[PDB]
């Protein structure tokens, strides 16, 4: 019974893990389109430590993805809530603004914004990129902090108003702790979203603010050398010691 | 006068549960509120507190309008019935919540919620989550959570349900003891009624939002004033009887079932008239009749008794064939005869003793 | 009542600017007409929807859909059973295994299809495993078929619905378990009686983000199962980006979002 | 001052760009782009951005300079222009190089696997129409170039901009159907490495690089002709740095520069006098650099007015059979 | 013998919560369990039912091991305390669930579900969720749907603390009722003592863990066998005595609060050794005495008096330093004589209604 079940779970982490391992050992091949084993060697990494033009892609889209991620998962938690226990005039206009988001073809919206941003003088860059990587990213979140938010028990919210709570208090103290995982959770979608996008940020960026995505995207001419390999090794090794290190230091 | 309700009307989903209510709450007063269980009771809590507002009428306290104020600025707290209680932290957050939403200053957070603590017997479980302690435990902590404030009106409802009788009683005493030394207004639901009516001041009886009977809790006992109130507060069998002649300014001659007795009544009264002659457990005698000739006293048969503790219930059926309800306390030791089933009995009453309504 | 206001202003203030706006636009370019050397100029036409009437838009429409709803279901089946077992693993454990599926997520799309298409391909190191050891005489082909897009599509968007399932199923209320248990329940009546009616919210959330984010992706299916078959995107793409007709592009998007809409009812 | 470079990620080598920044102070600033398509529609619509030099197609080398979005190239200070094979330089889609000079060219044609398939059981364009073949074709995907393959099967030419020759491309390209296994949407020589496909189109380029990995690749000249390609460089016609553009032309249009590109990638080159400067087996590889009679005789993708409209509408019923 | 506890032993998070229990429960019995607030009475009930594995020991069911056997196997029922209740279900739903659960016949379905709203008197509240119901009518629904199974073993886990008095003695009555018809064992765990008494035949009485005292529910008020059993059942002064001669046997001198008097003891004693007398408040004489000279009784002065109703109690202090309780009718109003305050008065019990221990 429990042998089934841990075979169901690694199933699923095998499934998830085992191109990575494939990636990670790539990096290392001499073959640049490995399908086989040609030998070791440490070429690839040398020639990523001097290219001085992917390294600034990476920064750029960490930066991105950092912002973009906080800004969206605040406001969006805020939506919600507004939407659960406010009472105002209109909340399908603003329930509907969410789906349209969610329904745009992603070539659409790389040119209604980017018409948009000349007409409003916004200049492209590092804020246009922010002002379009906040305003998808919205709708998950706003769907995960309602379906966690459904459910809830009135009793804690009426004592905390009774004890003499101001809607501050109340919300961060009491909504924000029994309704972490689902902020957690669009905190980590949010993240992954703005990492993958290709179509939107290759319009409304500008001469100089050029991304990671953009550059693999266009390698598609002359092949994917196993420079990529080589990077996302170094970001995973990151992403990992940093949860290990987050984790041991406090909890 | 502290807080005044003036014509407050209440429905739930279109079928009323507070029709009219007029209710005056003074300083330094203990008031007690009891109900057919279902009636009105927990909804006027929250109505007074800054919960649920009302359809119509005034709610005033300290001559000011308040029927429009919100929760967060009346200077008011409670105890629920459910033990509201913040599930992610200890005790001692629970406790000191109220305290630091007044922005109260961060060197006597401790000692303060430390001696409510005591207050409550739990300065030992400072530390533990409400999930791991049980019911009685909870209630104490919710009642610590109130009461670590100063407020000047507190509601309770139903906070020394969980408790054992000897826990209880020294709840009852810290509370009088903090309401003699401080100054707190209290409004205490309960169902308990000898509990009620040691512990307070003035005691009102509801009926689906209709208020029966207020007064101090002796006229509650001695003198019902329905005949809803006098089956509610106790145990109480209820005789029929005619008046007959009228002997006296306070003496009236009455058939009541079916011998002839002298009652005191102080109304206007007319031959022709049907009264409730009402009598209670421990007013009346038993005595052995072996004769057969009987005269004064209703003649019964005892049929089972129950003794509940201290006092010893027992039943005696009448010819006519009603129970009557006589009570007595217990003395085992005693041998002359305590007990004794299925034998002929009498049964009598001392009078001026009854209470007469029509 | 101050801080409600803000919240109110702020969250409508940002939709507006940055959602209807743009909208009021697309709306107002789809009643226009085709000019080359300004995309789009001043006259007002409706043949940009009485176009829509050819059979070519009504079958991608209806492929599209059933590829988006058995990706969905795919996902529901793989991953409710996931979240009910890491449901039950110890406390410490729980957010260091949430964190481990989802830092497989943080790499680029494209790499990572590289990687499924080397580990599943005729030549692949599969088959060389599964030849070398014996079974397996020739090789087996699973690339470039319908199920190799349902296997990215899974892929892509396994967390979408993990995420909001794992949310709805740690917030469950003991006693009412318990209780259940108690009054002579088993496993299969549970499931059906009471963990369903008080989970369904996940569901929907997580069914919502599989199913609406997979008609945009058809990049994936084309890297993975060929071009054998249309979709809406291809379409949309071709006619913004090699057709040069903005106004029918416009059309398109608008008549997939309202059927989108009123399917869902 | 600094100049602005619009080209493909890795088209152009780094460090390579290091020498020309320490010979002249000039400093580039490096912006990339998916397609073609994406580069001409962000061109057009943002007039506030302003690029240096970019590189198009044989297609958008044309269409962009009766519309002005592109400028004369003043050969007189271009010191380097003789390096450079007379073959490519006058074409019908620039008549005088006056707005384009060449830089990577190519070619596409039928691809065999030797393990499995005999390299000369194919001939012709034609034979890929047997029945035998079912189910075990490449295609490339974009619309000219497989009507250009059926086209040139009927004997036409590529741009056509006649309604009833492309009728009759359709209905052949109809037949091809069940012979189609997948359509390729990346690299040529990526589906041929796992062992997906043994036969079909596949660029020349593509096929020597999968070469120099151990799979063998051979590539056959169809009779019916080859197709050609070919990218070049360009000023964008709003520049506020043209002099640097125009040394930096200068710069890649040399010898050396251009023996280390055509290293780092497979694809041919148009300098003359560099591909002698490289390996003797190399230079002398047929289907690299083919023959002159070929090349000048040869077709490219010029451009058609209104009827690109028509392939596209095409290639999209083609698909949805 | 229907359950048999040998050996249980439970720990909680490293901490004893149950040492050691050896209990068993026989056919057609009411149990009552008491204890003080913390004691352990609802795990025990959780060990009983399938929920809580023990860490150690054995329980048999008739004779059969259910030690490992999971719930949904085992006939037992419970009545929560915190009213497990299901919020997305009616109040009908709720009741048949159970029924459905078994796989009953669908004919049979409504009429017992509506006999059973019928004995908790909700047959009008059919069709309403749970929160908009009262507290009261939660509980009765709970215990609604718990009885409709009829099953061999219920546990009750204060399921009568939510109503008024006349409803509460009805649903007694109809749970004896039950229990005479149809031979269901009962396991009743409460905190009101008089109904504790007024209902039960085994009362066991426990502390930490330990089973202190079983017995009927006459040996626990007339007859404690520990200090704490006598100090926990209800309201008791102890006094200390030292015997100076033993008279003829059941019958020894001591002296007790200065006065030498005669206690019925009836094991053997040697002189020296200290004794507590224990008596009950109802069991005290109160005299007045106006002569200066006081004979046969302790001296002592009325401190106040409580208006507990029905009875009446009163505090006296001796010039001892102690404060000893005296109750009374009070019902006894409208006398000519017994009210008074603060005089010298005497206490004098009736000799043999003691209790000694060593
Ligand atoms: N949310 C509600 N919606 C509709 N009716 C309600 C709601 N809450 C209560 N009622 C009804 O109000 C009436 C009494 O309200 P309430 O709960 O305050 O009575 P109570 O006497 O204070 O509680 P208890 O029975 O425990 O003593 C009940 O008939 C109850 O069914
Ligand atoms: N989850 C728990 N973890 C650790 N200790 C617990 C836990 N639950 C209860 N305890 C401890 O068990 C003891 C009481 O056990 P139990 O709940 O069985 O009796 P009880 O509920 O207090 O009886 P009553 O309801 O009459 O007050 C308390 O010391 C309490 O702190
Ligand atoms: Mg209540
Ligand atoms: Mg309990």
Redesign the pocket.
């Known amino acids: 019974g429990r042998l089934l079940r841990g075979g169901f779970m690694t199933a699923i982490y095998a499934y998830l893990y085992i191109p990575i391992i494939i990636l990670i050992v790539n990096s290392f091949n001499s073959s640049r389109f490995g399908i086989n084993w040609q030998g070791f060697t440490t070429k690839w990494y040398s020639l990523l430590m001097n290219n001085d033009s992917l390294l600034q892609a990476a920064q750029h889209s960490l930066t991105m993805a950092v912002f973009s991620a906080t800004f969206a998962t605040l406001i969006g938690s805020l939506t919600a809530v507004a939407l659960y226990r406010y009472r105002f005039r209109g909340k399908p206009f603003v329930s509907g603004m969410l789906f349209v988001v969610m329904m745009s073809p992603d070539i659409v919206m790389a040119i209604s914004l980017l018409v948009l941003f000349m007409l409003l003088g916004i200049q492209l860059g590092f804020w246009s990129l922010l002002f379009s990587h906040i305003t998808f990213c919205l709708p998950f979140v706003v769907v995960t902090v309602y379906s966690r938010l459904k459910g809830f028990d009135v009793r804690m919210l009426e004592a905390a108003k009774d004890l003499g709570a101001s809607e501050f208090t109340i919300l961060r103290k009491i909504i924000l702790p029994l309704a972490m995982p689902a902020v957690a959770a669009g905190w980590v979608l949010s993240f992954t979203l703005s990492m993958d996008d290709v179509v939107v940020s290759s319009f409304v960026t500008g001469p100089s603010y050029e991304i990671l995505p953009l550059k693999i995207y266009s390698m598609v001419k002359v092949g994917v050398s196993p420079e990529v390999n080589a990077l996302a090794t170094i970001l995973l090794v990151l992403s990992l010691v940093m949860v290990i290190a987050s984790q041991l230091i406090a909890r | 006068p502290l807080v005044q309700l003036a014509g407050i009307r209440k429905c739930?989903?279109g079928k009323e549960?507070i029709p009219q209510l007029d209710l005056t709450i003074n300083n330094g007063e203990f008031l007690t509120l009891l109900?057919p269980?279902?009636?009105?009771?927990?909804?006027v809590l929250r109505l007074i507190a800054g919960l649920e507002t009302v359809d119509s009428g005034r709610i005033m306290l300290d001559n000011e309008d308040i029927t429009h104020v919100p929760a967060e600025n009346r200077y008011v707290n409670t105890v629920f019935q459910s033990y509201a209680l913040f599930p992610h932290m200890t005790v001692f957050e629970n406790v000191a919540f109220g305290l630091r939403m007044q922005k109260t200053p961060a060197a006597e957070i401790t000692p303060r919620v430390m001696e409510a603590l005591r207050m409550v017997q739990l300065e030992t479980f400072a530390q533990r989550k409400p999930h791991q302690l049980s019911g009685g435990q909870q209630q104490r902590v919710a009642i610590a959570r109130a009461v670590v404030n100063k407020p000047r009106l507190l509601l309770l409802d139903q906070s020394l349900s969980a408790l054992d009788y000897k826990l209880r009683k020294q709840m009852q005493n810290e509370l009088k003891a903090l309401q003699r030394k401080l100054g707190i207004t209290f409004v205490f639901v309960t169902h308990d009624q000898e509990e009620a009516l040691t512990m307070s001041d003035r005691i009102v009886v509801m009926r689906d939002g209709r208020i029966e009977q207020d007064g101090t809790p002796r006229e509650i006992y001695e003198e019902p004033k329905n005949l809803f109130v006098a089956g509610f507060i106790g145990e109480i069998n209820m005789f029929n009887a005619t008046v007959i002649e009228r002997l006296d300014e306070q003496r009236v001659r009455a058939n009541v079932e079916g011998r002839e007795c002298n009652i005191y009544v102080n109304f206007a009264v007319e031959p022709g008239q049907k009264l409730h002659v009402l009598l209670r457990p421990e007013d009346l005698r038993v005595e052995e009749i072996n004769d057969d000739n009987h005269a004064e006293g209703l003649i019964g048969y005892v049929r089972e008794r129950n003794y509940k503790g201290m006092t010893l219930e027992s039943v005696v059926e009448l010819e006519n064939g009603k129970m009557v309800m006589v009570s007595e306390f217990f003395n085992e030791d005693d041998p002359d005869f305590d007990h004794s089933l299925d034998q002929k009995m009498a049964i009598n009453w001392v009078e001026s003793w009854e209470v007469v309504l029509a | 009542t101050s801080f409600q206001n803000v919240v109110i202003v702020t969250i409508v203030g940002w939709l507006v600017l940055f959602v209807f706006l743009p909208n009021l636009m697309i709306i107002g370019t789809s009643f226009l007409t085709r000019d080359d050397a300004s995309f789009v100029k001043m006259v007002f036409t409706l043949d940009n929807y009485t176009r829509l009437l050819d059979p070519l838009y009504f079958e991608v429409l209806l492929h599209s859909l059933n590829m988006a709803l058995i990706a969905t279901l795919a996902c529901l089946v793989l991953g409710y059973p996931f979240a009910w077992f890491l449901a039950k693993l110890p406390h410490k454990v729980r957010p260091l295994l949430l964190f481990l599926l989802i830092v497989p997520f943080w790499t680029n799309s494209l790499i990572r299809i590289y990687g499924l298409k080397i580990f599943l391909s005729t030549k692949g190191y599969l088959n060389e495993f599964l030849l070398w050891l014996g079974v397996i005489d020739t090789p087996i082909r699973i690339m470039f078929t319908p199920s190799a897009v349902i296997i990215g599509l899974v892929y892509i968007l396994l967390p979408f619905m993990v995420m909001p399932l794992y949310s709805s199923i740690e917030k469950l209320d003991k006693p009412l378990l318990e209780a259940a248990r108690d009054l002579g329940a088993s496993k299969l009546q549970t499931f059906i009686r009471i963990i369903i009616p008080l989970t369904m919210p996940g569901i929907i959330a997580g069914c919502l983000l599989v199913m609406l984010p997979a008609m945009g992706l058809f990049y994936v299916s084309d890297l993975m199962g060929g071009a054998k078959n249309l979709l809406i995107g291809n379409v949309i793409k071709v006619q913004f980006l090699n057709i040069r007709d903005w106004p029918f592009g416009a059309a398109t998007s608008i008549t997939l979002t309202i059927v989108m809409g009123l399917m869902l009812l | 001052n600094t100049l602005y470079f619009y080209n493909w990620t890795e088209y152009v080598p780094p460090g390579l760009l290091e020498q020309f920044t320490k010979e002249t102070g000039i400093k580039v600033i490096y912006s990339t782009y998916e397609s073609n398509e994406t580069m001409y529609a962000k061109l057009k619509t943002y007039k506030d951005g302003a690029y240096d030099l970019v590189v198009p197609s044989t297609y958008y080398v044309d269409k962009m300079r009766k519309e002005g979005m592109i400028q004369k190239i003043d050969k007189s200070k271009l010191t380097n222009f003789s390096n450079l094979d007379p073959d490519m330089l006058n074409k019908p889609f620039d008549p005088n190089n006056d707005y384009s000079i060449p830089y990577i060219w190519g070619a596409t044609a039928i691809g065999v696997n030797g393990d499995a398939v005999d390299p000369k059981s194919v001939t012709s364009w034609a034979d890929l129409w047997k029945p035998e073949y079912k189910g075990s074709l490449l295609l490339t995907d974009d619309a000219r170039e497989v009507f250009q393959m059926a086209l040139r099967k009927l004997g036409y030419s590529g741009n056509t901009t006649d309604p009833k020759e492309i009728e009759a491309a359709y209905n052949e390209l109809k037949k091809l159907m069940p012979n189609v296994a997948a359509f390729n949407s990346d690299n040529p020589a990526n589906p041929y490495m796992e062992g997906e496909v043994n036969l079909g189109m596949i660029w020349n380029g593509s096929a020597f690089v999968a070469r120099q990995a151990g799979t063998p690749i051979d590539v056959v000249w169809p009779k019916e002709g080859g197709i050609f390609w070919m990218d070049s460089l360009a000023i964008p016609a709003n520049a506020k740095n043209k002099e640097g553009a125009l040394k930096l032309i200068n710069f890649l249009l040399r010898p050396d520069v251009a023996k280390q590109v055509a290293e780092t990638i497979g694809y041919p080159t148009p300098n003359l006098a560099a591909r002698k400067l490289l390996s003797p087996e190399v230079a002398n590889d047929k289907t690299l650099y083919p023959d002159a009679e070929t090349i000048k005789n040869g077709e490219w993708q010029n451009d058609v007015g209104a009827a690109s409209s028509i392939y596209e509408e095409y290639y999209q019923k083609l698909k949805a059979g």
Do not use: E, I, L, R
């Open positions: 739930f989903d549960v109900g269980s279902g009636c009105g009771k927990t909804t």
